[PDB]
Design a protein around this nucleic acid. Structure first.
Ligand SMILES: [Cs+]
Ligand SMILES: [K+]
Ligand SMILES: [K+]
Length: 14
RNA sequence: GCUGCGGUGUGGAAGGAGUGGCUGGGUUGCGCAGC
């Protein structure tokens, strides 16, 4: 699972 | 690989989910959770 570590709105980008 | 929650703050006690985010912690960091 080496992708988006966290979600919701713009959280966890970059 | 995807997604949800201002839930967290060397401001988080008058805020949001970035219509402030090339103005900072932060190429949206940190925690929790789901597929
Ligand atoms: Cs934040
Ligand atoms: K802020
Ligand atoms: K913030």
């Amino acid at each position: 699972g080496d992708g988006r570590r966290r979600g919701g709105g713009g959280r966890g980008q970059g």
